[PDB]
Amino acid sequence: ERIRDLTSVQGVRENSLIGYGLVVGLDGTGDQTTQTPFTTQTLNNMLSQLGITVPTGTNMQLKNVAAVMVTASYPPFARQGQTIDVVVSSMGNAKSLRGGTLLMTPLKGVDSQVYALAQGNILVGGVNQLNGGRITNGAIIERELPTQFGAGNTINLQLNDEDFTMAQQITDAINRARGYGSATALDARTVQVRVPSGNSSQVRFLADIQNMEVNVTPQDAKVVINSRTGSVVMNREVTLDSCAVAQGNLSVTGGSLQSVRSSANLNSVVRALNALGATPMDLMSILQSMQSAGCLRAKLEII
Amino acid sequence: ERIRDLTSVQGVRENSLIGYGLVVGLDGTGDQTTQTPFTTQTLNNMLSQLGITVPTGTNMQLKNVAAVMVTASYPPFARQGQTIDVVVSSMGNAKSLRGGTLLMTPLKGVDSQVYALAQGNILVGGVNQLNGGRITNGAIIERELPTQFGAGNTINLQLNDEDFTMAQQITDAINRARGYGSATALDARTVQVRVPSGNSSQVRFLADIQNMEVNVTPQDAKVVINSRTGSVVMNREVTLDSCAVAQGNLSVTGGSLQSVRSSANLNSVVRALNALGATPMDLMSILQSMQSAGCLRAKLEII
Amino acid sequence: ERIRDLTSVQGVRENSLIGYGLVVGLDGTGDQTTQTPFTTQTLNNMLSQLGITV
Amino acid sequence: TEFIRFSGVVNPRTISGSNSVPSTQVADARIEYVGNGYINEAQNMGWLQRFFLNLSPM
């Protein structure tokens, strides 16, 4: 509940798979084949594999076919015959993929070898995006990747965020639950755990570890500003000193300078900032100038 | 009820079949044959196989014929003579497939060998898609695929989702139901079960295993955002810390900063988020910035 | 609460990573390929790696 | 009879969509065009003329 929500097991990771395919059955929303020659070329390749040899030179104008790219996530410890979901995105100048059907598509990784075959029906919500869709259980795994799991006697747990204090807390929790030399902290997001040999013993050890509960120590104070979406999110550890704030078209409810008192609690910070009565767009400039002046104590990150 | 709803048997998997065919009997909704030469070419091939040798060079304009692609799913342990459903999707520039009839169509896999023959009537709902349809029991299996089932003494159960704790629970359930050395956990989505030799013993063992009941351990907290369909779905394990939220055109029911208290239960999270009074479109940006700030505890996935 | 909010540890630092990619699935909002030749050139490179030789 | 012989090493990504490669893209190419019969015999220099070409003072 806490170990599985804060750390990851070494050697347990996902991968990316990509492929190219075609979507048929569209209601006149396919791309212009006069401007995209790869659609007609791959259609001729598919027909020649099937057994139909169209002559070259003759023009083909299609309205129900759209060239697409297919993306998928390869799960850890994957076996052949299992099903994964895929994301289908239109390339070229197609209009919409409403009620389409994806044909056979090889899914290859960065090693240029196949790992999955994809075929299914595209679900579009139908504002909403029209050139993108998702197929549930649309691809079947057909190649397995060997793993180093089971061998050795040590396994590393990798934290999502770097912290010496959190890694020490995780190591102390494992040590007080299992035994003295159960775990060893390597660095701020790497904790090494000693496990017995054999696959069944390691699986049982990881099942007992992953559902442990560990208190979460207070973290670094941080204020995040997203100017593209117009959002400002603060943290529970953010404090404030006493300073003076001047801002265009703002006044005391009557001078132009507004005084902000020193605040330790988060509710005091929210009360002091809402006393200014500013929009979030102006609040971004106020927070940036306050961090430059040093009155703001948290670190400022602009995403 | 639980084993069959969470795991799959090794060697039991579906496959994909594809083919090319024609649909006749349309009410003037066929594709333009002047722009699609493959329709007229395959019609000449069908007539020449039947015995009619049309001369070349002469133009043919048709309104009742549409070129289509046929997709099908090959079931496990399939026998010749059995029936499966097929999906018919129009290629080219046809208008609709309302009240059409599909002729004979070979269905081939990736090995370029036939496995099924398809012929039937297309059912269209009749907004609704017009270039796609489904035929129930429209194809007959005519080639059987050999299997390795029955031999050996071990069989692997493959989990749908990777979890060491769930695999340990499944192994413990099988061990307390059947015997001591009945099952062995290999990895996070692979459990090996020892079975006696012979096909009848393995079938009886799988029939007893598949209807077992096993409690489902709590999973990882995860929040899923689909921006294309405009949906946000949270999980039962999602928790929240205390933070501050600022957002454009939002205010307390009167400052711009809104305080969110720390929440453990899911109902408290829903109550705290509905106190903001934001649209789901704005809630996506709020949740993304909250996960970047670390106030959100669940992992965020954008599908 | 104060040491971690005022100081940094030696040898503990972030870095920058950059890359070039393509975005597909847009609803007609892509760039003009007649004025940007690198989009079509890299698309041909991606298709040639995949196996399609336009 | 006429004989045309070709050998080379070709990168697979240089192959066009019509399964055709120009010969300038082929690495380490060997191209041979020969013949036999009296037509090919009529284009060979005589032995004394070959010796006079190789061993003349000028």
3-class SS at A260? strand
CB pairs under 8 A between A and B: 261
Question: Which residues in chain A are contacts of B226 at CB distance < 8 A?
Answer: 125, 134
Q: Which of C5, C43, C49 sits opposite A297 (nearest CB)?
A: C5
Nearest by Cα to B245 from A288, A235, A263: A235
Contacting residues of A for B156, CB less than 8 Å apart: 79
Instruction: Kindly report the number of other CB atoms within 10 A of residue A116's CB atom.
Output: 26
The three-point CA angle A200-A202-A203 to 5° equals 65
d(CA A125, CA B280) in angstroms, rounded, equals 16
Q: Please count the residue pairs, one from chain A and one from chain D, whose beta carbons lie less than 8 angstroms apart.
A: 3
Q: Are residues C54 and D13, on separate chains, in Cβ contact within 8 Å?
A: no
- For residue B182, the SS3 value is coil
Beta bridge partners of A15: A74
CA distance to partner chain C, nearest, from residue D30 (Å) = 26
**A174 φ, ψ (degrees, to nearest 5):** -65, -35
Structure token digits, residue A143: 């190649």
CB-based contacts of B52, cutoff 8 Å, min separation 6: none
3-state helix, strand, coil in chain D (%, to 5): 35, 30, 35
Instruction: For residue D44, count other CB atoms closer than 10 A to its CB.
Output: 8
Q: What six digits make up the tokens of A283?
A: 């609040």
Helices B164-177 and A199-210 meet at what angle, rounded to 10? 120
E strands, D10-49, in order: 27-35
Gap from A175 CA to chain C (nearest CA, Å): 25
Q: Which bin fits B80, alpha (ψ -120 to 50), beta or left (φ > 0)?
A: beta
Interface test with D, best of C44, C47, C53 (most D CBs within 10 A): C53
> Rounded distance, CA B249 to CA B256, Å?
8
φ and ψ at A204, to 5 degrees? -65, -40
Cα A11 from Cα A50, distance rounded (Å):
41
**Nearest CA to A303 among B24, B14, C20, B291?**
B291
Select from B90, B91, B293 the Cβ nearest to the Cβ of A235.
B293
Q: Do the beta carbons of residue B3 and residue B170 sit within 8 Å?
A: yes
CA dihedral D35, D40, D43, D49 (to 10 degrees): 110
Strands (E), chain A: 7-9, 15-24, 66-74, 83-90, 101-108, 114-121, 132-141, 154-159, 183-187, 190-194, 222-226, 231-234, 243-246, 257-260, 299-302
d(CA B290, CA B241): 10
Structure-token pair, residue A227:
């100017």
Quote the minimal CA–CA distance from A301 to chain B in Å: 9
Cα(A244)–Cα(C23) distance, integer angstroms: 46
The amino acid that residue A271 corresponds to is: R
Query: What is the token pair recorded at A118?
Result: 């994809």
| Contact (Cβ atoms closer than 8 angstroms) between residue A297 and residue A220 | no
| Phi then psi dihedrals of residue A112, to 5 deg | 60, 30
Q: Which residue has the tokens 């057994």?
A: A51
User: Any bridge partners for residue A86, and if so which?
Assistant: A72, A135
Q: How far is C44 from chain D (nearest CA, A)?
A: 11
Look up residue A188 and give its two tokens: 């701020």
Query: Radius of gyration (Cα) for chain B, nearest Å?
Result: 28
For chains C and A, having 3+ Cβ pairs within 8 Å is answered yes
- End-to-end distance of chain A based on CA atoms, in angstroms? 29
Angle at the Cα of B40 from the Cα atoms of B39 and B46, rounded to 5 degrees? 90
B302 forms beta bridges with B225
Q: Tell me the Ramachandran region of residue A95: left when phi exceeds 0, alpha when psi lies from -120 to 50, beta otherwise.
A: alpha
**B254 residue type, one letter:** G
Name the structure determination technique. Answer: cryo-EM
Amino acid code (one letter) for B232? V
* Residues written for chain B: 303
Alpha carbons A68 and A90: distance in angstroms, whole number: 4
The number of beta carbons lying within 10 Å of the beta carbon of residue B63 is: 14
CA distance A262 to A241: 4
C54 contacts on D by Cβ (under 8 Å)? 17
Instruction: Decide: D and C in contact? Rule: 3+ Cβ pairs under 8 Å.
Output: yes
Tokens 């697979």 found at = D12
The residue count for chain C: 54
- Beta carbons within 10 angstroms of residue B46's beta carbon: 13
- Judged by a CB distance cut-off of 8 A, whether residue D12 touches chain A is no
- Of A41, A95, A221, Cβ closest to residue C54: A41
Main-chain phi, psi angles of C30, to 5 degrees: -75, 170
Cα(B254)–Cα(A235) distance, rounded to whole angstroms?
21
C54 with C41: CB under 8 angstroms?
no
Candidates A89, A93, A237; nearest CB to C25: A89
CA atoms within 13 A on the CB side of D7: 3
Q: Which residues have CB under 8 Å from A160's CB, separation 6+?
A: A6, A7, A8, A189
Q: Which residues contact B206 (CB under 8 A, 6 or more apart)?
A: B9, B155, B195
Q: Do the Cβ atoms of D17 and C49 come within 8 Å?
A: no
Q: Token digits for A301? A: 């990150």
**CA atoms of B72 and B84, how far apart (whole Å):** 8
Residues of chain C found within 8 Å of residue D25, distances taken between Cβ atoms = none
> CA B284, CA C40: separation in Å to the nearest integer?
33
Element (H, E) at B72: strand B66-74
Q: How far apart are CA B264 and CA A245, in angstroms?
A: 37
- The neighbour count for residue A119, using CB atoms within 10 Å, is 23
Six-digit token pair at A246?
A: 């001047």
- CB proximity list for C47: less than 8 A, separation 6 or greater: A20, A38, C53, C54
Backbone phi, then psi, for C43, in 5-degree steps?
-65, -40
Nearest to A3 by CA among A150, A177, A195, A152: A177
Chain C residue with Cα closest to A189: C12
The answer for residues whose C-beta is within 8 angstroms of residue B134's C-beta and 6 or more apart is B85, B86, B87, B88, B122, B123
Which residues contact residue B50 at a Cβ distance below 8 angstroms, ignoring those fewer than 6 apart? none
| Residues of chain A contacting residue B168, judged by C-beta atoms under 8 Å apart | 203-204, 207
**What sign does the CA torsion over B76, B77, B80, B82 have?**
negative
Strand order in the sheet with B183-187: B7-9, B154-159, B190-194, B183-187
Collapse the DSSP code of B292 into the 3-class scheme (helix H, G, I; strand E, B; otherwise coil) and give the result: helix
Written as six digits, the tokens of A230 are 């117009």
Parallel, antiparallel, or unpaired: how do β-strands A66-74 and A15-24 relate?
antiparallel
Instruction: Return the exposure string of B163-194: e unless at least 16 CB atoms fall within 10 Å of the residue's CB, then b.
Output: bbbbbbbbbebbeeebeeebbbbbbbbbbbbb
Could you tell me the two tokens for A172?
Answer: 């102390």
- CA-CA distance, A240 to A261, in Å (whole number)? 8
| Residue in A89, A93, A221 closest to C5 by CB | A221
Question: In this complex, which chains have at least 3 CB pairs below 8 Å with chain B?
Answer: A
Chain C: residue whose CA lies nearest to A107:
C50
Residue in this structure with the two tokens 């106020």, named with its chain if needed: A286
| Chain C residues with a Cβ under 8 Å from any Cβ in chain A | 1, 4-5, 12, 24-28, 43, 47, 49-50, 52, 54
Q: How many CB atoms are located within 10 Å of the residue B254 CB?
A: 7
Count the Cβ atoms, other than its own, within 10 Å of residue A129: 21
Burial A68-88 (b: 16+ CB within 10 A, else e): bbbbbebbbbbbebbbbebbb
Distance from CA of C38 to the nearest CA of A (A): 15
B89–A229 CB contact, under 8 Å: no
Query: What is the 3 state secondary structure string of B99-159?
Result: CCEEEEEEEECCCCCEEEEEEEECECCCCCCCCEEEEEEEEEECCCCCCCCCCCCEEEEEE
Distance CA B152, CA B193 (A): 11
Helices assigned H by DSSP within A16-94: 37-50
- Of residues B101, B19, B21, B34, the one with CA closest to residue B64: B101
What phi and psi values does residue A117 have, to the nearest 5 degrees?
-115, 135
Integer Cα distance of B108 and B71 in angstroms:
10
Place of tokens 């989990």: B159
Q: Which residue of C lies nearest to D15 if distances are taken between CA atoms?
A: C53
Is there a contact between A132 and B91 if contact means CB atoms under 8 Å apart? no
With an 8 Å Cβ cutoff, are C48 and D15 in contact? no
Query: What 3-state class would DSSP assign to B38?
Result: helix
**Chain C residues within an 8 Å CB radius of D12:** none
CB contact under 8 Å between C27 and A93, yes or no, is: no
DSSP SS3 for D49: helix
Sign of dihedral through CA atoms B155, B161, B167, B169?
A: negative
Residue A241 near residue A297 (C-beta atoms within 8 A) = yes
Q: Using CB atoms within 10 A of its CB, is residue A34 exposed (0-12), middle (13-18) or buried (19+)?
A: exposed
Q: Which residues are within 8 A (CB) of B105 and not within 5 positions of it... i.e. 6 or more apart?
A: B19, B20, B21, B70, B117, B118, B119
Token pair listed for B266: 């899911």
Interface residue of D10, D13, D21 to substitute, partner C, most C CBs within 10 Å = D13
- How would you write A197-236 as a 3-class SS string? CCHHHHHHHHHHHHCCCCCCCCCCCEEEEECCCCEEEECC
Shortest Cα distance from B302 to chain A (angstroms)? 11
Distance, CA of B248 to chain centre:
39
d(CA B107, CA B116): 5
* B114-121 vs B132-141, strand pairing mode: antiparallel
Q: Is D42 helix (H, G, I), strand (E, B) or coil?
A: coil
> 3-class SS at A64?
coil
Residue B121 bridge partners (DSSP): B101
Nearest residue in chain D measured CA to CA from C54: D17
Residue A267 Cα to chain centre, angstroms: 31
Are the beta carbons of A258 and A275 closer than 8 angstroms? yes
Q: Does D12 touch chain C (CB under 8 A)?
A: no
- Closest residue by Cα to residue B186 from B162, B212, B219, B215: B162
Question: What is the torsion angle, in degrees rounded to the nearest 10, for the CA atoms of residue B209, residue B210, residue B215 and residue B221?
Answer: 130
The 8-class DSSP code of residue C52 comes to -
Using a CB–CB cut-off of 8 Å, the residues of A that contact C are 19-20, 37-38, 41-42, 69, 89-91, 93, 95, 108, 112, 129-132, 162, 188, 218, 220-221, 237, 297-299
Any D CB within 8 A of A48 CB: no
From the CA of C39, how many Å to the nearest CA of chain D?
20
Task: Compute the distance between CA of residue B269 and CA of residue B267 in angstroms, rounded to an integer.
Answer: 5
Which amino acid is residue A40, in one-letter code?
Answer: T
Q: Residue A291 has which token pair?
A: 């961090």
Reading phi first (left if > 0) and then psi (alpha if -120 to 50, else beta), residue B152 is in: left
Shortest Cα distance, chain B CAs vs residue A181, angstroms = 22
CA dihedral (B94, B98, B103, B104) positive or negative? positive
Confirm if A26 and A92 have CB atoms less than 8 A apart: no
Cβ within 8 Å of residue B156, ≥6 positions away:
A79, B10, B186, B190, B191, B192, B193
Question: What is the distance in angstroms between the Cα of A210 and the nearest Cα belonging to chain B?
Answer: 8
CB B90 within 8 A of CB A60: no
Q: Does D25 touch chain C (CB under 8 A)?
A: no
| A41 and chain D in contact, CB less than 8 A | yes
CB of A7 closer than 8 Å to CB of A169: no
Helical (H) or strand (E) element with A174 = helix A164-177
Task: Give backbone dihedrals phi and psi of A120, rounded to 5 degrees, phi first.
Answer: 175, -165
- Chain A hits for B217, CB-CB cut-off 8 Å, are 211
Q: How far is CA A157 from CA A181, A210, B122, B133, C11, in A?
A: 15, 10, 55, 50, 21
The length of chain A, given as a count of residues: 303
Please indicate if any CB of chain D lies within 8 Å of the CB of C18. Answer: no
- What sign results for the dihedral spanned by CA atoms B67, B71, B72, B74? positive
Q: How many residues does chain D have?
A: 58
Q: Where are the alpha helices (DSSP H) in chain B?
A: 37-50, 164-177, 199-210, 266-274, 280-293
Residue A224's beta-bridge partner residues? Answer: A233, A301
Classify residue B296 by its DSSP letter.
B
Spell out the residues 6+ positions from residue C6 whose beta carbon is closer than 8 angstroms to its own. none
